[PDB]
């Protein structure tokens with residue numbers, strides 16, 4: 001095609017993220033009258049999300065996904081998006097990004113500092129905890145060897161509940177679980193399904209600890225080279241895809257629980273009050289480390305009403 005573009009991602013071909021990227025690619029090809037063709041590179045072929053963000057910045061990759069929280073690597077106050085139990089629901093996540101002074105500033109900085117344009121935001125599930133032994137209460141977390149991604153907020157979740165965190169890349173998790181090199185991991189239900197972690201974990205606990213969004217990002221180097229009519233095609237297709245992406249996750253959360261039960265997984269519902277209590281010193285550490293910028297972001301987010 002005139003524009004042979006590439007979209008990289010961490011998740012595999014069975015995932016909701018891939019299905020939504022496929023819809024995006026199909027709509028762009030149709031509505032651009034074949035001028036743009038997007039190829040998909042799943043399963044971390046091009047690196048992890050940190051590496052792929054760098055590739056958008058330098059113009060060697062055209063599209064990728066990221067969470068709003070991942071920008072904590074550049075702007076420490078953006079950790080607020082993944083402080084455990086702070087963001088209640090997806091309504092709050094949307095308004096935090098688009099309808100606060102903090103969020104609007106972050107969108108501007110992505111463009112000016114990092115060379116990436118935000119096209120759309122979707123819901124990517126609420127993270128839960130799987131393990132090789134039952135989690136009936138906070139006591140069962142003590143000493144659990146919990147895999148986490150290479151992200152400070154996930155590491156903190158594990159440390160503050162008393163687990164022993166082990167950071168590793170997403171591609172390595174299935175084998176670590178299979179060999180019991182680690183005792184468990186944490187991810188939304190959809191990822192547990194897509195990666196088949198239910199084959200190698202007997203238990204699922206509804207810890208509801210971190211809510212993930214998903215941003216459709218384009219490299220400025222690519223976006224700038226498109227004529228404005230094709231920029232519009234891309235933007236409109238990203239907003240349509242994000243609607244579909246969100247629907248996939250919202251529908252799955254309804255009934256994936258019964259799918260896992262049919263596969264032999266036992267589901268627990270630990271009392272979350274001690275889990276939430278255990279995070280209080282972490283919120284304090286966050287404010288100490290990020291100062292008034294972090295305090296302000298927290299206050300803007302805590303002000304948002306979660307009811308539509």
Ligand SMILES: CC(=O)N[C@H]1[C@H]([C@H](O)[C@H](O)CO)O[C@](O)(C(=O)O)C[C@@H]1O
Nearest residue numbers: 010011049065066067070149151170187
């Ligand atoms: C956009 C993206 O790549 N998301 C990935 C996230 C983030 O890297 C992490 O939450 C830190 O932001 O990690 C996973 O959930 C994980 O490794 O378990 C896989 C998921 O595909």
